[PDB]
């Protein structure tokens, strides 16, 4: 909401999010208590909508622009877990860090056969 206020004032803004995965994990923690049936790996049934309704308003517009960097935790290093898998589609440049490269002491541990950009 603050990033959007600065955007609409005509400015151009930087928005850094510290870990967007926790935003869906907090929804998974509460989902079952709201009385909703579990989905594929215990995730809430509304995972993709809860994620899209947020990431669709973090965008630049003709009146001003938002440049954003988001850290995205992937659980158990599984890049096919539903949450990273649904997050991939919402980004222009995706940088994929891997443990098998960090263990070689090569930092930043970017995997160049999976990093990509529009």
């Amino acid at each position: 909401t603050m990033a959007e206020k600065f955007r609409d004032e005509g400015r151009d803004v930087l928005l850094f999010v510290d870990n967007i995965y926790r935003y869906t994990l907090a929804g998974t923690e509460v989902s079952a208590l709201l009385g909703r049936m579990p989905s594929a790996v215990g995730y809430q049934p509304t995972l993709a909508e809860e994620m899209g309704v947020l990431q669709e308003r973090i965008t630049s517009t003709k009146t001003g622009s938002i440049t954003s960097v988001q850290a995205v935790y992937v659980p158990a290093d599984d890049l096919t877990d539903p949450s990273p898998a649904t997050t991939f589609a919402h980004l222009d440049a995706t940088v994929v860090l891997s443990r098998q490269i960090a263990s070689l002491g090569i930092y930043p541990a970017v995997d160049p056969l999976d990093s990509t950009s529009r």
């Binding site: 443990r99 098998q100 490269i101 263990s103 070689l104």
Partner: protein
């Protein structure tokens, strides 16, 4: 070669001359000019190598066990 108490015959494996060895050398040059390479005769190594190449193909193990390498 006859020696005081020994005699040895240093036989050789094939007829030797000059008409023959020269043909051998001519063919040895020809095979080098036109790059003519013959196969060996080892059918055992051939079969083992082909099985080993087919078994290791599309194996992709190192992508799977996260061996950093």
């Amino acid at each position: 070669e006859v020696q005081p108490g020994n005699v040895t015959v240093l036989a050789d494996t094939a007829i030797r001359g000059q008409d023959l060895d020269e043909a051998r050398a001519m063919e040895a040059k020809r095979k080098a000019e036109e790059h003519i390479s013959s196969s060996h005769g080892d059918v055992d190594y051939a079969q083992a190598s082909a099985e080993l190449a087919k078994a290791i193909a599309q194996l992709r193990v190192i992508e799977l066990t996260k061996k950093a390498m």
